[PDB]
Amino acid sequence: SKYIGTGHADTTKWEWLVNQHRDSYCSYMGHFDLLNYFAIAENESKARVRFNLMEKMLQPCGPPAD
Amino acid sequence: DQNKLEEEMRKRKERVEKWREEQRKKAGKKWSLEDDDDDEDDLDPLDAYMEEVKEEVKKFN
Amino acid sequence: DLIFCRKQAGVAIGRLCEKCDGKCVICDSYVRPCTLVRICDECNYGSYQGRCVICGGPGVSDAYYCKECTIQEKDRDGCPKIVNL
Amino acid sequence: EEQKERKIMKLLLKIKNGTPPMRKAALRQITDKAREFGAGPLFNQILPLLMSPTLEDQERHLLVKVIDRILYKLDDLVRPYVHKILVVIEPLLIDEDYYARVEGREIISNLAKAAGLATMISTMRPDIDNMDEYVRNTTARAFAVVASALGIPSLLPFLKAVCKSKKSWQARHTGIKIVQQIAILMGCAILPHLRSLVEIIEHGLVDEQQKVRTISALAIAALAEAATPYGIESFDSVLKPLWKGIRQHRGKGLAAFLKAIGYLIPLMDAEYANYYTREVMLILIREFQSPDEEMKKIVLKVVKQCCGTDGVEANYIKTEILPPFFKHFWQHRMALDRRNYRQLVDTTVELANKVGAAEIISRIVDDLKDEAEQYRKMVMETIEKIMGNLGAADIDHKLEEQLIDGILYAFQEQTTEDSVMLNGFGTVVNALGKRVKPYLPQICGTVLWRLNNKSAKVRQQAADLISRTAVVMKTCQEEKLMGHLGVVLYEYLGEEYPEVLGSILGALKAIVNVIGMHKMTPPIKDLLPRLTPILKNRHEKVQENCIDLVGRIADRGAEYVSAREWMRICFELLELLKAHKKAIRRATVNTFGYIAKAIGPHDVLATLLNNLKVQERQNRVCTTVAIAIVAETCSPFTVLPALMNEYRVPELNVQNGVLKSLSFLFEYIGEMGKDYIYAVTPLLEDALMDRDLVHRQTASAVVQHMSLGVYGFGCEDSLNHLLNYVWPNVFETSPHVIQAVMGALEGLRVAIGPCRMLQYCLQGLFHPARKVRDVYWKIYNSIYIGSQDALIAHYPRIYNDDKNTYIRYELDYIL
Ligand SMILES: CC[C@H](O)[C@@H](C)[C@H]1O[C@@H]1C[C@@](C)(O)/C=C/C=C(\C)[C@H]1OC(=O)C[C@H](O)CC[C@@](C)(O)[C@@H](OC(=O)N2CCN(C3CCCCCC3)CC2)/C=C/[C@@H]1C
Numbered sequence A: 001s002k003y004i005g006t007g008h009a010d011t012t013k014w015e016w017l018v019n020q021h022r023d024s025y026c027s028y029m030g031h032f033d034l035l036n037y038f039a040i041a042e043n044e045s046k047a048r049v050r051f052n053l054m055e056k057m058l059q060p061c062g063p064p065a066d
Numbered sequence B: 001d002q003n004k005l006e007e008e009m010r011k012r013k014e015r016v017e018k019w020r021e022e023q024r025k026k027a028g029k030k031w032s033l034e035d036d037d038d039d040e041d042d043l044d045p046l047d048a049y050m051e052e053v054k055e056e057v058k059k060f061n
Numbered sequence C: 001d002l003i004f005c006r007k008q009a010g011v012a013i014g015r016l017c018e019k020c021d022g023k024c025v026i027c028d029s030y031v032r033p034c035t036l037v038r039i040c041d042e043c044n045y046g047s048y049q050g051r052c053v054i055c056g057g058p059g060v061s062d063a064y065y066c067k068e069c070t071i072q073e074k075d076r077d078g079c080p081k082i083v084n085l
Numbered sequence D: 001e002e003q004k005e006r007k008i009m010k011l012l013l014k015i016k017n018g019t020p021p022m023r024k025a026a027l028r029q030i031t032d033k034a035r036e037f038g039a040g041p042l043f044n045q046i047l048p049l050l051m052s053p054t055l056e057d058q059e060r061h062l063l064v065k066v067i068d069r070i071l072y073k074l075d076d077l078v079r080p081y082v083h084k085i086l087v088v089i090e091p092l093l094i095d096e097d098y099y100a101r102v103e104g105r106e107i108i109s110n111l112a113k114a115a116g117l118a119t120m121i122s123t124m125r126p127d128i129d130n131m132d133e134y135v136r137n138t139t140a141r142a143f144a145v146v147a148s149a150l151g152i153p154s155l156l157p158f159l160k161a162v163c164k165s166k167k168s169w170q171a172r173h174t175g176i177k178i179v180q181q182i183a184i185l186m187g188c189a190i191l192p193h194l195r196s197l198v199e200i201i202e203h204g205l206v207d208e209q210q211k212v213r214t215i216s217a218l219a220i221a222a223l224a225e226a227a228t229p230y231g232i233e234s235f236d237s238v239l240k241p242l243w244k245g246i247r248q249h250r251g252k253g254l255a256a257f258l259k260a261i262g263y264l265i266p267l268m269d270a271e272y273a274n275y276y277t278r279e280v281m282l283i284l285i286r287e288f289q290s291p292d293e294e295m296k297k298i299v300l301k302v303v304k305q306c307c308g309t310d311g312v313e314a315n316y317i318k319t320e321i322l323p324p325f326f327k328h329f330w331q332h333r334m335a336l337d338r339r340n341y342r343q344l345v346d347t348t349v350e351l352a353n354k355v356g357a358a359e360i361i362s363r364i365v366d367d368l369k370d371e372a373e374q375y376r377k378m379v380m381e382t383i384e385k386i387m388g389n390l391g392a393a394d395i396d397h398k399l400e401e402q403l404i405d406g407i408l409y410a411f412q413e414q415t416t417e418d419s420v421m422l423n424g425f426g427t428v429v430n431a432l433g434k435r436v437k438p439y440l441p442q443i444c445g446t447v448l449w450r451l452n453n454k455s456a457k458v459r460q461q462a463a464d465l466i467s468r469t470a471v472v473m474k475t476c477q478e479e480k481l482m483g484h485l486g487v488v489l490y491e492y493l494g495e496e497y498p499e500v501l502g503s504i505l506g507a508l509k510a511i512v513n514v515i516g517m518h519k520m521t522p523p524i525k526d527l528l529p530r531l532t533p534i535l536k537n538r539h540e541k542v543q544e545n546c547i548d549l550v551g552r553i554a555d556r557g558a559e560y561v562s563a564r565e566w567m568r569i570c571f572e573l574l575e576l577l578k579a580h581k582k583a584i585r586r587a588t589v590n591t592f593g594y595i596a597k598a599i600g601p602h603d604v605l606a607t608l609l610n611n612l613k614v615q616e617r618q619n620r621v622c623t624t625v626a627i628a629i630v631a632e633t634c635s636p637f638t639v640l641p642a643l644m645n646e647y648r649v650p651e652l653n654v655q656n657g658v659l660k661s662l663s664f665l666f667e668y669i670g671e672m673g674k675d676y677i678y679a680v681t682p683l684l685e686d687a688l689m690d691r692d693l694v695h696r697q698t699a700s701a702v703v704q705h706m707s708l709g710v711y712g713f714g715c716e717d718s719l720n721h722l723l724n725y726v727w728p729n730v731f732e733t734s735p736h737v738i739q740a741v742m743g744a745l746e747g748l749r750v751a752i753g754p755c756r757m758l759q760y761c762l763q764g765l766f767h768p769a770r771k772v773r774d775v776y777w778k779i780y781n782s783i784y785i786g787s788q789d790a791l792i793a794h795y796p797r798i799y800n801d802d803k804n805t806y807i808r809y810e811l812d813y814i815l
């Protein structure tokens, strides 16, 4: 429960999906050749891709329900 | 065998003693750095700085 | 009330007593000790300086994780000292 | 109301004799409460309880933490009480307890951070000029603590002012003592402020008062010791006065100046170190003749410090330093002097470490024969230290003869059994090695005479010597009176003292372990039946040495005793796997392995299965360990068929024993199990389909140990097959079964991979029933905490809805 990203019987789809999006972005920031792949694919500098991922970290999957 | 071992010891001891005899013929005040105790024998810049401090404490109060 | 401490471990080495000498602190196995145990600073202080991590008696030798616990990275949690409340 | 706050701040008793949860709760609440309670009542009550004459150590620690937290919050309201607190806690800084000192320093540090520098200075300044020497020491230590807390440059002006005071010499003395205590307390952190402190204290070396000069020299020594091995440009204005003073002073001040010189010399270059050593060396040689003993200790320390630098070379040392050193310090008066004895030994060893072993060793080896035995033990200690640190290479024929004769005469002339002569003899013979051929007859005669009689405290020392020297005894190609010694050691096998029996067994083992079983005199078929009743002795040393000896015999001389006696010995060793001591268990494991390798796995395995069938719990567990040992020494191919044939018995409590044995077998063999997973898979299937709960729990344990044993060896097929049978047990309420199932699942997470586990959890993560969701989320959290990173590549695709975006688009890029 103290670890961030764990769930329980009341976990919703939104929390699950934002958790996997957030650690996906962190894994992209960590691994050197995944960021290379993305920066070649979208034709940007690697610093720009890193900053874009950090900016996307705040609200991935949009704002929550109700 | 035990008697021989006892003999061997006796002879070695005798040889050492003879050599020794041969050689012999041929031939506090207490103080500590942990104390300031000296043995027998027996304007100002500190007040100015103190006055400057006293002034700061009085002003704060 | 057998609960692990689970605080940030420091530079202090865990100790075992004469009764627990060969034991693993987490699974209580005796086979293949592999990794030296580290404990936090509140477990290593004053009267607590040298003590068995399993029971709390006078330590005599180093505590170790087993190869099985090292493979599963169970040596990466906090202080493994058994603390009672 | 006043006692209102008192009755409510009995929170400190809530904490003192209280539980840890309410301990921390009351801690937090009293931290929130402190600013409103006020420092007056809080301190008025806590300082008595900290002054309690019989408080504990950890109660004191918790009180200090309470002080820290209630001091952080109330910052500038603690001023009017500072003085009072100090009079309570200015002691605890000269206390003989280390942790009391740490706690006092922490309290004073938090107090200085709470209050200001001006307040601390204003309360501490009146006691600077006190006449009671007990106050001027705590004041200096507290000023050092305040400097360590608030920084050195914040106190530098007050220091510069106080040790220029022309009012009294006590203020100057206390300021220099503050600098010294700052150095002592902070260590190598004073290096950026070294020159500032040195220029603040340097003018005291030429004072008109002799106490100021001494404390200035001590402060310089402290700074130089804190700075090493850095900082010599900052010690430049002190070189002239210090050396002029050692040239003019005499006595206590001379000792302080010499200590300063000795701590400063190792910071120089070869030139200055070489040039300065000459001066201080003529002065030190003059001071060799001093009657005072403090002076002797300081001179020895300075000699050791200076002779360890590069600017001083062995030529100058042997030409100028060694004659007076050995003429003035090596007399038995030094030996009965217990204070400087260790200092002399260390200084001599560190001299030999630069000038060469031969000269030192000769000059003291002629002195091994002496009327006083204190002077003998001293020489022996020094000699064996030098021998262990450098060796016996440049020791020659005359020196070798003298060494051997001296150590032999010292061995015989021995009143009480000491470890000094034993270790000296051992290391001398071990360093000489194959060079001592005729002194081998001589030493054998000596140890024969010592081992023959005299109270068995000489006999056990002789046995220790044999045990530690038998290697070089036999490697010199000599075996006969080696057997003469072994015969006598054998006759010394009935002893009422277990301590002597341990040494006897150790010597016998060292003999039989180093000489070959070939061509050796005392027969094994005589030693072993005499040896087997000693295995039941209850002393730890006797037991360990007996087990080691039986193990060596079984390893090398296995063909000299019948297999029936080996079977009896192994069945007796079975009970020693429960020993409370680790060395007994280690030796027992080794010896059981040797006996099993010797007599063959078949008969011992049959006996072990019979024993596993009929006995109580602990003996059955030991039998399981023994089966695992047999299967590891003799390949598990020889054990597995007979063990699987026992699972065929149609009776519970027999199959469960087979399952426990398989569990421990796989856990014990680890990587070797990669060739045997296909053989035990149908048995584990059968056990996992069984209604009995212990069957399934033990099968899960086996699966876990097998999974963690084979990892990186390509055994995923059988492990997935077995997971297909383990998984249906997740809905089990029995705690032991579910514990074993969780263990097996976490082992399969490593051996099989997290992708398969996520594939098993996906459909249950969002089941309508809360039981399924609880179980699956527990399993999922266990999979997620380990290998969170791998799961990134395994998550399934989830489509966007009208409100939210769920596709990860970056992974869809195609270069
Ligand atoms: C179910 C088993 C039981 O829990 C049992 C182990 C234990 O609970 C009982 C209590 C008690 C006191 O009777 C026994 C306890 C423990 C033992 C008999 C172990 O031995 C010791 O304590 C002595 C010491 O810890 C080291 C023993 C040692 C090295 O044999 C140890 O095993 C190992 O380290 N191994 C076995 C595996 N072996 C191979 C060889 C290749 C490379 C190394 C790893 C794999 C290396 C050596 C365990 C042995 C006994 C189970």
Ligand SMILES: [Zn+2]
Pocket (backbone or CB within 6 Å): C024, C025, C026, C027, C028, C029, C065, C066, C067, C068, C069
């Ligand atoms: Zn473990």
Ligand SMILES: [Zn+2]
Pocket (backbone or CB within 6 Å): C016, C017, C018, C019, C020, C052, C053, C054, C055, C056, C057
């Ligand atoms: Zn213990």
Ligand SMILES: [Zn+2]
Pocket (backbone or CB within 6 Å): C005, C006, C007, C039, C040, C041, C042, C043, C079, C080, C081
């Ligand atoms: Zn801890």
